[PDB]
Design an enzyme around this catalytic site. Structure first.
Site, PDB file in Angstrom:
ATOM      1  N   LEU A   8       0.877  -1.108  -0.065  1.00  0.00           N
ATOM      2  CA  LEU A   8      -0.056  -0.046  -0.072  1.00  0.00           C
ATOM      3  C   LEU A   8       0.756   1.270  -0.022  1.00  0.00           C
ATOM      4  CD1 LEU A   8      -2.718  -0.998   2.827  1.00  0.00           C
ATOM      5  CD2 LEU A   8      -2.477  -1.413   0.270  1.00  0.00           C
ATOM      6  N   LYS A   9       2.199   0.911   0.068  1.00  0.00           N
ATOM      7  CA  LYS A   9       3.062   2.158   0.147  1.00  0.00           C
ATOM      8  C   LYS A   9       2.611   3.270   0.980  1.00  0.00           C
ATOM      9  CE  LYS A   9       5.114   0.715  -4.101  1.00  0.00           C
ATOM     10  NZ  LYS A   9       5.844   0.993  -5.170  1.00  0.00           N
ATOM     11  N   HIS A  89      13.202  -2.359   0.029  1.00  0.00           N
ATOM     12  CA  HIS A  89      12.600  -1.933  -1.164  1.00  0.00           C
ATOM     13  C   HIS A  89      13.370  -0.980  -1.883  1.00  0.00           C
ATOM     14  CE1 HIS A  89       9.100  -0.378  -3.342  1.00  0.00           C
ATOM     15  NE2 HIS A  89       8.602  -1.597  -3.436  1.00  0.00           N
ATOM     16  N   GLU A 137      12.253  -6.791  -8.148  1.00  0.00           N
ATOM     17  CA  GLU A 137      11.825  -5.576  -8.525  1.00  0.00           C
ATOM     18  C   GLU A 137      12.773  -4.770  -9.367  1.00  0.00           C
ATOM     19  OE1 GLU A 137       8.798  -4.658  -4.481  1.00  0.00           O
ATOM     20  OE2 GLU A 137       8.672  -3.520  -6.450  1.00  0.00           O
ATOM     21  N   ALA A 196       1.388  -3.117  -6.246  1.00  0.00           N
ATOM     22  CA  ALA A 196       1.000  -1.797  -5.528  1.00  0.00           C
ATOM     23  C   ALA A 196      -0.077  -0.889  -6.665  1.00  0.00           C
ATOM     24  CB  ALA A 196       2.243  -0.769  -5.236  1.00  0.00           C
TER      25      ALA A 196
HETATM   26  O1  LIG Z   1       4.763  -1.251  -9.807  1.00  0.00           O
HETATM   27  P1  LIG Z   1       3.786  -1.327  -8.836  1.00  0.00           P
HETATM   28  O2  LIG Z   1       3.146  -0.016  -8.544  1.00  0.00           O
HETATM   29  O3  LIG Z   1       2.791  -2.596  -8.863  1.00  0.00           O
HETATM   30  O4  LIG Z   1       4.792  -1.273  -7.355  1.00  0.00           O
HETATM   31  C1  LIG Z   1       5.498  -2.632  -7.050  1.00  0.00           C
HETATM   32  C2  LIG Z   1       5.830  -2.531  -5.557  1.00  0.00           C
HETATM   33  O5  LIG Z   1       6.965  -1.854  -5.594  1.00  0.00           O
HETATM   34  C3  LIG Z   1       5.856  -3.885  -4.878  1.00  0.00           C
HETATM   35  O6  LIG Z   1       6.827  -3.738  -3.644  1.00  0.00           O
END
Ligand SMILES: O=P(O)(O)OC[C@H](O)CO
Ligand SMILES: O=P(O)(O)OC[C@H](O)CO
Ligand SMILES: [Cl-]
Ligand SMILES: [Cl-]
Lengths: 214, 214
Positions: A8-9, A89, A137, A196
């Site tokens: 949810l950041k 992260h 990521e 997210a």
């Molecule tokens: O690219 P998003 O918005 O799905 O974000 C990914 C997040 O960094 C997962 O922790």
């Protein structure tokens, strides 16, 4: 058998006063995916008190209770009923020695760490410290509309290979929007996903999430 | 006209389930001291809900609502009703550009920053960015039984001099235990105090605090 983490950041729609009303719209899920949500640090105690879903922190400190102004200690989280955390992260990167110290602490305490990495070299570096999850990521795709599975399929395969036959599960994230992105990620060897914006910024978060895990 | 800040850090007695019990024992005060408590980041939304005292965060991030995993944004704090924060504590030191960016942001938003420093040269470095409070705390005395006013009276005078005629109030902290320590600090030109162990670890926190501000 798979894991889905909804981060949810610090998004306005899912933090602060909005946290409760945002979560209110979801229902537990039975399927192949263990569902985990990651609320903002300011919301974590609230989240933990409910416990309607499994919640992980967004970041965690190894320092114990004591004279640690401005920290979020692992021991305090454990006492609140939080059983894990995201670490390193791309938006909250840490020195390597801090990471190692934190993994070492968590490994004693049955506290789950989801260790984010930005490339295969970082993934390998941390292998000997046996993180529970590795979350690949790529930094530049985060928040975008191009899936990690579309853009980096070879890196996903390399990281999966790195961790093959270890107790560590490999997750992938960045730009995941569709069921197809999720199928493709599982197809390349991943054990789950992080998401997210694809969920949080949707017109119907609950339905968007269901599309990913069905 | 003076300010007293009680920093709860991550002390077991005043965090988590213990936060409410710990605060329950205090009553507002009428006197020369404006009383501020600083709860742990995990307890802050709880604290803000109540508002029986004025609460400041232990640390704050300048980043807005958005994609900032593991952050504690100033805007989120403001929406919860938190009106200030400690920054750059010895236990939570920051790069100078981060600090400057945060002050600049707070100065636009009527959010109060209590900027900690470790020495006079650092106090001077920050003067042109106009922090609302400067908090002089010598790193090696924190948590000890020797008062900053006993051990560093000339440095207190030097910092006060640096800020003389500015809008910045100078506070002092580290090893403050008695009413005498406080009187001596005011006597050297300080406009108030920060205290942690002297209050939090006392047999009677409420009475210990009253001894300081009477
Ligand atoms: O690219 P998003 O918005 O799905 O974000 C990914 C997040 O960094 C997962 O922790
Ligand atoms: O020496 P203490 O325990 O009062 O600690 C002072 C704190 O560092 C003030 O923030
Ligand atoms: Cl937002
Ligand atoms: Cl403690």
């Amino acid at each position: 058998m798979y894991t889905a983490i909804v981060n949810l950041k610090t998004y306005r729609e899912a933090t602060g006063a909005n946290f409760t009303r945002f979560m209110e719209k979801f229902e537990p899920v039975q399927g192949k995916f263990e569902l985990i949500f990651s609320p903002s640090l300011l919301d974590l105690e609230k989240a933990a008190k409910c416990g309607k879903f499994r919640f992980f922190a967004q970041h965690v400190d190894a320092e114990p209770y004591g004279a640690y102004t401005g920290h979020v200690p692992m021991d305090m989280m454990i006492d609140l009923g939080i059983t894990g955390s995201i670490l390193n992260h791309s938006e909250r990167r840490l020195p390597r020695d801090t990471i190692i110290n934190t993994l070492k602490k968590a490994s004693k305490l049955d506290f789950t760490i989801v260790l984010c990495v930005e490339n295969a070299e970082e993934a390998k570096y941390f292998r000997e410290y046996e993180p529970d999850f590795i979350a690949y990521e790529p930094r530049d795709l985060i928040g975008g509309d191009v899936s990690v599975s579309t853009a980096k399929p070879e890196i996903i395969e390399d990281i999966v290979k790195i961790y093959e036959g270890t107790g560590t599960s490999v997750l992938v994230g960045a730009g995941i929007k569709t069921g197809e992105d999720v199928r493709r990620s599982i197809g390349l060897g991943a054990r789950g996903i992080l998401v997210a914006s694809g969920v949080v910024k949707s017109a119907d978060p609950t339905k968007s999430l269901n599309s990913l895990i069905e």
